[PDB]
Write a structure and sequence with these properties.
Belongs to the protein kinase superfamily. Tyr protein kinase family. SRC subfamily. It is found in: Cytoplasmic vesicle, Secretory vesicle; Cytoplasm, Cytosol. One of its GO terms (molecular function) is phosphotyrosine residue binding. The protein is an alpha/beta fold. It has one domain (1-107): SH2 domain (SHC Adaptor Protein). It is built from 2 helices and 6 strands. The chain has helices spanning 13-20, 81-90, and strands spanning 7-8, 29-34, 42-49, 55-64, 70-71, 101-102. Strands 1, 2, 3, 4, 5 and 6 form a 6-stranded mixed beta sheet that branches. β4 (55-64) and β5 form a beta hairpin. The longest helix has 10 residues, at 81-90.
């Protein structure tokens, strides 16, 4: 029917970078992961490129509100991450580059 594997366990930033730079993903690939040390917080990771360095990976912290949900920019927040992911799929609207497709996961 349909599956959503854009979210990953408490993976490390180095492990998330190895999964992105890994052979399979490409520019536009994004993934979410919960904090490791500072539990309760989230961390987003997307793929980006530079005309100077080249292939790179961006990481945006995701904070929560006392009475809300999760937000990255002090403009618009989201009660859920599923709504922020969809919004990010429609356009960056804050990010450097809109989202394309979620990390790969096929067996």
């Amino acid at each position: 029917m349909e599956t959503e594997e854009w979210f990953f366990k408490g993976i490390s930033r180095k492990d998330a970078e190895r999964q992105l730079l890994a052979p399979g993903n490409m520019l536009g690939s994004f993934m979410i992961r919960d904090s490791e040390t500072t539990k309760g917080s989230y961390s987003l990771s997307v793929r980006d490129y530079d005309p100077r360095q080249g292939d790179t990976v961006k990481h945006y912290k995701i904070r929560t509100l006392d009475n809300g949900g999760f937000y990255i920019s002090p403009r618009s927040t989201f009660s859920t991450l599923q709504e922020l992911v969809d919004h990010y799929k429609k356009g960056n609207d804050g990010l450097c580059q809109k989202l394309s497709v979620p990390c790969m996961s096929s067996k």
